[model samples]
Target: GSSFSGKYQLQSQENFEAFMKAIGLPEELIQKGKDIKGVSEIVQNGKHFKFTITAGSKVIQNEFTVGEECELETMTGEKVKTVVQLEGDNKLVTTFKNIKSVTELNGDIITNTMTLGDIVFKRISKRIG
Candidate 1:
């Protein structure tokens, strides 16, 4: 619900082999996403926020506010959590369903990391226009 704005182009991913399978994602879908880039558009207004993600043939969108409980969809089109807690004015954190959501902002780059029971899936994105 803060400074994270603009469109960030998906740059890279790590630990897909470990995280994806654990989440029960299809191998084909993983292969498909393993190659393409997606753009995440985050719009923040005070304590309100909305983020739209677009990839090849898939899209994910959600709206939530700080300290508010709402349903948020993940990359797998699954719902999770009810709170978006701000950290140090730069990082956002939430946890539920045994997965922890972490989003940190640094200059023109934003790193989104999801931690599962054992595997951590990391995505690095950079602002573009």
Candidate 2:
């Protein structure tokens, strides 16, 4: 299984403040979040929506937010629909069938940190050893 770890921060205070106002949240929620000590977490687990989070007093309690499955990795040679948008801000959406599935992989090669499909192709191109 492949997984990744990363972090995200609000782009700017103005944008962050405006977003909170637009969403109609309690003042403390925005205020606490603006402080340098504040921290936020975002998570991904393939299909998404997989947890319950409880924070200590240092981090205030807030409503839950979660990710919904939206996209998949694509192999270099496969045909699939792709879309990207930037109307309000940069956004991207694509719809495709099994672009990231193991079915697309060729099974006769060894690989690490790269797609199994690419690995197999490389081996076959050089006569899989």
Candidate 3:
């Protein structure tokens, strides 16, 4: 939990737009989302966590406890059920409708792998604070 307390800025993304499209994101929003340098801040206190993702004009914040189901809103404005849990020591796994994401923190970098159906997109973020 202490390992995930930091601010991470997006450094690179691979196949993000394709995954966005697959998840039904609008074209204009997808284009804007592609160019924005998003930042994710995770503060974990034992089993409770606060996750905030900010990109350009869009910001999404989530607060949940590990191993519990909660409602979450997607970038496409769709509400879905999600479960977030810790995998290993420095990895956070989030499970959504048809999506599964694994975020791992290593040194000053955090890599997030998001999988939707058969498409898997990777976003690498560097620690800013």
Q: Pick the candidate with the highest lDDT.
A: 3
Model 1 worst lDDT window (10 residues): 73-82
Candidate 1 residue lDDT tens string, 27-125: 888888876778999998877889999878888999888888978987666898678888877788988678898999999899989999878989999
Clashes of each: 0, 0, 0
- C-alpha lDDT (0 to 100) for residue 40 of candidate 3: 92
Candidate 1, superposed: residue stretches over 4 Å from native: none
How would you encode candidate 3's per-residue C-alpha lDDT over 15-58 as one tens digit per residue?
Answer: 98889888888999898789788999988888888889999979
Error of 2 at 95 (Å): 16
TM-scores of the models, in the given order?
0.92, 0.29, 0.92
lDDT by residue (tens digit), candidate 2, 1-129: 112112222222323444444435466766655543222332334323121112224432221112233332222223333332212211112234412211111232211121222221111111121
lDDT (CA) per prediction: 0.85, 0.27, 0.86
* Better by lDDT, candidate 3 or 2: 3
Record all residue pairs in model 3 with backbone atoms less than 3 Å apart, i.e. clashing.
none
TM-score of 3: 0.92
